[PDB]
Amino acid sequence: MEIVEYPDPILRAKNKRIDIFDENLKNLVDAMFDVMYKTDGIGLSAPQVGLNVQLMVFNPAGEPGEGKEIVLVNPKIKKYSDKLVPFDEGCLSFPGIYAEVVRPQSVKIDARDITGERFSISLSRLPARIFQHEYDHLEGVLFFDRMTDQVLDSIREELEALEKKYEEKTGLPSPERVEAR
Ligand SMILES: CC(C)(C)OC(=O)N[C@@H](Cc1ccccc1)CN(O)C=O
Ligand SMILES: [Zn+2]
Ligand SMILES: [Zn+2]
Ligand SMILES: [Zn+2]
Ligand SMILES: [Zn+2]
Ligand SMILES: [Zn+2]
Ligand SMILES: [Zn+2]
Ligand SMILES: [Zn+2]
Ligand SMILES: [Zn+2]
Numbered sequence: 001m002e003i004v005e006y007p008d009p010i011l012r013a014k015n016k017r018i019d020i021f022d023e024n025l026k027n028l029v030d031a032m033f034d035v036m037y038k039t040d041g042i043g044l045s046a047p048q049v050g051l052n053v054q055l056m057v058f059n060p061a062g063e064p065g066e067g068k069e070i071v072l073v074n075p076k077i078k079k080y081s082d083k084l085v086p087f088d089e090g091c092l093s094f095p096g097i098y099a100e101v102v103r104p105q106s107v108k109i110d111a112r113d114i115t116g117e118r119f120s121i122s123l124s125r126l127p128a129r130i131f132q133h134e135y136d137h138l139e140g141v142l143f144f145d146r147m148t149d150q151v152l153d154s155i156r157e158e159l160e161a162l163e164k165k166y167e168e169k170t171g172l173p174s175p176e177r178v179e180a181r
Contacts, residue, residue: 001035003092004050006162009175011093012140015052018073021116025055029071029114032057037064039092042130045137048093056134060127070121075111077135078120080104087129091143097158101146103132144178152181 004010018025028046032055036044042062046055054074061067081104089101106124109131113119123131133143144152144159156178163174 001031001049003035003039004048005095005166006091006093006142006159007166007174007176008093010047010050010052011137011142012176013047013052014140015047015054015138017054018112021073021112021114025073026114028055029057033059033069041092042127043134045134047137047140054138056131056138058127058131058134060123062130071114072109072111073113073116075109075135075138077107077132078110079108081106085129089129089133089143091133093137093142094144094159094162097155099144099147099151099155101133101143101151102148103129103146107132152178 028051032044032046032049035049036042036057036059040062042060043056043058046053056072056075058070058072059067060070083105084102085105086100086102088098090098106122106128108120108122110118110120136142136146144155147155159178163177166172166174
């Protein structure tokens with residue numbers, strides 16, 4: 001497996017609804033949880049492991065044998081709190097890059113579980129922060145999209161280094177450039 005890095009177009013592509021709730025889905029969910037634990041995460045979205053589907057694995061405790069393993073298939077955020085909070089946010093798709101992002105403090109979510117059954121969940125604090133970050137991934141939205149112009153300016157060169165790395169690895173032009181903003 002791999003974590004897909006910016007500016008790989010997989011991180012922007014449309015993520016497809018999941019219709020099939022079978023053993024293959026269970027196997028993918030297992031693999032994703034295990035990447036999440038390997039990388040000390042609280043949540044992981046399918047596009048970040050190269051699969052453009054509406055799937056997130058999540059454990060609010062973010063540690064083995066703690067919290068709960070929540071599978072969110074086709075999730076939708078139904079409500080965002082009016083209250084906003086800043087947080088020094090990171091992203092595995094942008095290795096070593098951290099910057100301030102302002103987001104709602106809490107959210108309410110509708111999703112389907114591993115069997116396709118509807119459920120809802122409310123999150124606050126760090127779990128809500130991580131969820132929103134990963135939910136953005138499911139909508140092809142990356143964390144610098146959420147930064148102020150001033151904060152973005154502070155990481156532009158780091159993003160350009162990633163753009164160059166992609167061009168060197170693939171022989172293709174970077175499909176997006178932070179310059180465009
Ligand atoms: C920032 C605007 C476009 C006003 O609304 C959103 O993108 N809302 C976000 C929640 C949010 C994130 C960060 C700061 C403030 C609110 C929800 N959203 O993507 C709606 O399309
Ligand atoms: Zn691998
Ligand atoms: Zn496993
Ligand atoms: Zn596991
Ligand atoms: Zn940890
Ligand atoms: Zn992630
Ligand atoms: Zn991320
Ligand atoms: Zn939006
Ligand atoms: Zn430039």
